[PDB]
Amino acid sequence: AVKVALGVAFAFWWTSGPGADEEMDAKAQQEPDRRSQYTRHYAFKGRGRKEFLRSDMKNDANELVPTR
Amino acid sequence: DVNKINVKIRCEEVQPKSMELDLDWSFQLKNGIPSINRQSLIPGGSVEVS
Amino acid sequence: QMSEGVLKPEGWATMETVAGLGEEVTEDEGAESFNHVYYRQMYELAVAGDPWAQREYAAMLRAYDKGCESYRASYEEADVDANVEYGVESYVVDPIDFGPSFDPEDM
Amino acid sequence: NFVYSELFVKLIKECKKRIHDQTFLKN
């Protein structure tokens, strides 16, 4: 009861900062998005294709077994 | 006493509470000042409560 | 595509029952890579003559035969166990989960 | 004659025994 009153009362003061709309314009002015994670993909359709990064490839172990 | 057997049981309850908070910010550098106004620390993330 | 970090290529995989003849082994890249070129070298020397190479290659052949016969015996045992547990029936996979929908999801 | 082949066989056999043995490494 006291906590949910004091948190909202502090939010009223902290949210009421000056200007408050130029930063909306600053954030929305960069309509190019944040840069997204790179994957190897095909040129025509963009399905992922397998990678040979050393820090992942150094953990891999395979073996050979006879067939039936 | 080799003709006895003692069975011991250990059990764990579940911890049911979980939450995940995923925020992001953005600052525009007009110059070296990183624009530390009060209406700049407002994030744009997501909240998950389980 | 041409600049994505420090890469590392594909190597040789070893047949575990003949490497480390009979007895159980552990993993190490240099030892397996050594064994693969070592046995080709000992084959060439054994063909050329050289009784010390012929011993090593024959010992490898003995372990190879023993491991192969053991592994086909394991296949026969697994087939008999499956023919006991189910009848002439077969084992069936799980269907793929596509997430929620406004459909009865076993349609 | 014949010395380098004998030394080669002895050296790679010893390198197989006391190094590069996975059962040795397991123990």
Q: How many CB pairs under 8 A join C and D?
A: 45
* Number of Cβ atoms within 10 Å of the Cβ of C44: 12
Q: Are C14 and A64 in contact (CB under 8 A)?
A: yes
B14 backbone φψ class: left, alpha, beta (φ>0; ψ -120 to 50): beta
Euclidean distance between CA atoms B18 and B49, whole angstroms: 6
Euclidean distance between CA atoms C18 and C65, whole angstroms: 9
B45 Cβ neighbours under 8 A, 6+ residues apart: B21, B22, B23, B24
Which token pair is D17? 């025994």
Choose among C52, C14, C32: nearest CA to D14. C52
C75 Cβ neighbours under 8 A, 6+ residues apart: A68
Give the CA angle between residues C76, C81, C83 to the nearest 5°.
Answer: 95
DSSP 8-class letter at A41: B
Q: Tell me the CA end-to-end span of chain D in Å, nearest whole number.
A: 40
Euclidean distance between CA atoms C61 and C25, whole angstroms: 18
Residues of B within 8 A of A20 (CB-CB) are: 39
Amino acid letter for position B9: I
Resolution for this model in angstroms, one decimal place? 2.5
- The C-alpha torsion from C26 through C27 and C32 to C33, rounded to 10°, is -160
- Give the D window 2-21 contacts with C, CB below 8 Å: 5, 9-10, 12-13, 15-16, 20-21
CA-CA distances (angstroms) from residue D26 to C13, C15, C23, C67? 18, 16, 10, 19
DSSP bridge partners of B21: B47
Query: Residue C52: closest CA among chain D residues belongs to which residue?
Result: D9
Choose among C61, B34, B26: nearest CA to A29. B26
Q: Are C22 and C63 in contact (CB under 8 A)?
A: yes
Q: How many CB pairs under 8 A join A and B?
A: 25
Euclidean distance between CA atoms D15 and C26, whole angstroms: 18
User: Helices D3-18 and C29-48: crossing angle, nearest 10°?
Assistant: 150
Q: Are C60 and C21 in contact (CB under 8 A)?
A: yes
Q: How far is CA A52 from the centre of its chain?
A: 23
